[PDB]
């Protein structure tokens, strides 16, 4: 029941104490793993904040303190009376700190502990929403210099007056079906770009068109909104070398901001908690540009390096892929846009791993999510076991606000 | 209880009925997933369940279930146990067997030619020298001279697990490493281990970066002895590029048959604790692995100097393109020399469809995603957007410790 990790690479072995607080179900048991599948009250209320609250008093060297005796009585009087409780700024920050803290399918988290969180939960309307998110992007960009950034919109009360951002992330490209039969811009935003204009939206139908704000506040119907042009950084793509790259007339964005999930602290739920760090090229360069359910341009860009794509072990995909991935680099480098690469990144989680397993006993850890979807091998994440269990505080998926929503 | 899997780039939706047949356990709970660890004397007592289960699942597949000859082995086989202990497979229930641990294998992505095995029985076999024996043959047949055939050759059962037959090498073709007084590595980092007791027991290491090493047989409990495969039985393929002539002066080569024999086939219960088995690579093991991994031959570094890259900073992915351009030198050598090989895409594409076949026939396809995901350019192949379902099936091919661990040393 204390667990050993092996670094097959290395040779280097930790031991994992923290699994055994961990709270939440995987989806696998003894008899099957599911590790690869995408989506595996006051009563139920009070010794969830018990058990937030004892950590949040242990992580400040006051366990069993007075103030953390008082507190605990607290919010015990206030849920009892009340149904539910308010968290205090500074468990409302920690709170934000350990769900990042916690998830287990992050590579970056070894910038943790440096998140800005804005408490947003005075909001009450679409339009305050807007301004708040207006104000997370223009925070995170900072000019090209990207910040970590949440900002906490109010916790859900009786799943009626729900605060959700219906965008998935804060920017994003549209999606189109042409009668073509074809797909215009991003096809993993169809169906959202149709409830935009469902609601009003006049698209551009252009291939990159930044997507407006769905906003919805306090359970009502929701609304668009534009991000101000000028607070949305973009970077035009082109190669170190070859110069025919710039007229296939790419381009993305500098900021991501997943804006979709449910940040779960101390049994309560903010519905509506937009957050953003930066990029590693991956991403961009081979999902968003290279997987076939996507931009899919691999043929195109293979076919102006006049590649021999008779065969599939020429591996023209592979070269391509490569080159991609270094002009998405090579173009967020060039305009000053923080990013960074595979390499970097991943040496950096280990380092991470490394001092979670000294100074906290464990660190939760996704294998089929951390090692990047290309070059697995040669990053050292690849050779690194780990153990996947569910912490609380925790970003959580949610169904998507349209199969939901009472209009 | 049904469970159902997701393609993300197609949304094929598949249904898996089949894991309930699951025994073994995984190593995972509803608390934890250890879905990324690579590594997580039978009585008669366990021993008949364990027998009727695989007997109850031959006679299905044969369509004579529940037939008189089903039921007379079912009593031949009790009657054998409890009077002998254990009981003897027919020459169709090991085949059979065979092609089953192969075909419930979740780690290889290559299961679509689990049929198109050639089985050879060595459970005969009395001596290491008949075991070099049958080796030097199972070697010869699956090379045909780069026409790669798959093939297991299995050895006699264990009794009381102090007569064991094992081969001692991890695959029966491999290079040796040596480890240097300067603390660098001559050949093969992977190893030097079982090099040097290779040495020990009386080898003598011609010192290269290509050494073939010898064979290291146990027969029936006793002492391993060394015996070298004629070389003429060993393909090797030079590594050179198609557009880069300098590569050929890197001084690479490979053997052409990767031979497995480490590993214990499970049958009914029976443990075949030596059973070699041989397939064709695909390009990424050697290419991505053998070469590129930093604890094997670790070339990445040269290969991208004489390229000429930007070696400075990670981000002008150096590395990434050295890698790539080593794995088109691999295939293309072996496709030039017409020697089986596959790459990374054609099998995996293979595999996805071999799944749903599975799905279809079978009711489902154990698999291992963390195993069948290809070692670079994951995304751009199928199998990174199959969900998969991961359990355990018998008959199967099981780890076991490495013999020089465990072995009583008879001298
Ligand atoms: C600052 C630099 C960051 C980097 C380089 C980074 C990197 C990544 C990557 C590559 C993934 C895999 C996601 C995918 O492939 O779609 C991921 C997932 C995730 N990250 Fe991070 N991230 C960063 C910041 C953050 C921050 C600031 C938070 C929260 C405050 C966060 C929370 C998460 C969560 C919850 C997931 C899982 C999302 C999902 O399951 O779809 N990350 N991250
Ligand atoms: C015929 C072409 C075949 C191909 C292309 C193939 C491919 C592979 C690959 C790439 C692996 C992962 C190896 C690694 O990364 O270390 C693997 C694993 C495996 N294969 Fe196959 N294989 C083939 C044939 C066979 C045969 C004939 C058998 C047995 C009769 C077999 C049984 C297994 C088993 C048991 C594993 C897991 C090994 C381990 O866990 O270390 N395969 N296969
Ligand atoms: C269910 N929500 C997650 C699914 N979404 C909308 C998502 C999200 C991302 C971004 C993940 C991420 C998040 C953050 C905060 C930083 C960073 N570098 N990457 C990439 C991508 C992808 F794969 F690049 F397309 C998809
Ligand atoms: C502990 N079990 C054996 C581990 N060994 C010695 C082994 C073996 C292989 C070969 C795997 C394989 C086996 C077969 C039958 C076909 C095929 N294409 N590939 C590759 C590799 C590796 F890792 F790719 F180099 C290692
Ligand atoms: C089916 C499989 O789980 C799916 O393709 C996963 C694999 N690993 C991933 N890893 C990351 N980082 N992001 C992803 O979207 C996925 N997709
Ligand atoms: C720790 C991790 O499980 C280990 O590096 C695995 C990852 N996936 C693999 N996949 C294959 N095919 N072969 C391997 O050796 C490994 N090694
Ligand atoms: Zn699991």
Same mark, same amino acid.
């Given at each position: ?25 995987? =989806? ?229 901001? /997943? ?26 360069? /081979? ?40 002009? *998405? ?10 990013? /960074? ?26 294998? *089929? ?6 070059? =697995? ?28 929503? *009472?209009?």
């Amino acid at each position: 029941r204390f667990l050993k990790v092996k670094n097959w690479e290395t040779d280097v072995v930790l031991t994992d104490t923290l699994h055994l607080k961990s709270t939440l179900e995987t =989806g696998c048991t003894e008899h099957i793993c599911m590790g690869s599948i995408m989506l595996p009250t006051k009563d139920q209320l009070f010794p969830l904040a018990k058990e937030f609250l004892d950590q949040y008093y242990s992580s400040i060297k006051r366990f069993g303190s007075k103030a953390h005796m008082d507190r605990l009585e607290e919010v015990n009087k206030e849920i009892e009376s009340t149904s539910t409780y308010q968290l205090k700024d500074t468990e409302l920050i920690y709170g934000a700190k350990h769900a990042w803290r916690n998830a287990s399918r992050c590579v970056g988290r070894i910038q943790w502990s440096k998140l800005q969180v804005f408490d947003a939960r005075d909001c009450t309307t679409a339009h305050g929403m807007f301004n708040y998110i207006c104000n997370h992007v223009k925070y995170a960009t900072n000019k090209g210099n990207l910040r970590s950034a949440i900002t906490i919109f109010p916790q859900r009360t009786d799943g009626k007056h729900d605060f959700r951002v219906w965008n998935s992330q804060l920017i994003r490209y549209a999606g189109y079906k042409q009668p073509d039969g074809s797909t215009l811009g991003d096809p993993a935003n169809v169906q959202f770009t149709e409830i935009c204009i469902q609601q009003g939206w006049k698209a551009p139908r252009g291939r990159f068109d930044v997507l407006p704000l769905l906003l919805q506040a306090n359970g009502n119907d929701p609304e668009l909104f534009q991000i101000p042009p000028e607070l949305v950084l973009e970077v035009p793509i082109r190669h170190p070398k070859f110069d025919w790259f710039k007229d296939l007339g790419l381009k993305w964005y500098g900021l991501p901001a /997943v804006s979709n999930m449910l940040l779960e602290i101390g049994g309560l739920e903010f519905s509506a908690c937009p957050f953003s760090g930066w990029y590693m090229g991956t991403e961009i360069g /081979v999902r968003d540009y290279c997987d076939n359910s996507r931009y899919n341009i691999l043929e195109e860009v293979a076919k102006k390096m006049d590649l021999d794509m008779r065969k599939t072990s020429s591996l023209w995909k592979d070269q391509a892929l490569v080159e991609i991935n270094i002009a *998405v680099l090579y173009s967020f480098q060039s305009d000053k846009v923080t990013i /960074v690469d595979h390499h970097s990144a991943t040496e950096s989680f280990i380092k991470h791993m490394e001092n979670e397993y000294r100074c906290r006993g464990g660190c939760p850890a996704d294998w *089929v999510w951390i090692v990047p979807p290309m070059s =697995g091998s040669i990053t050292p994440v690849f050779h690194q076991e780990m153990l996947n269990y569910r912490l609380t505080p925790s970003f959580e998926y949610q169904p998507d606000p349209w199969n939901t929503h *009472v209009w």
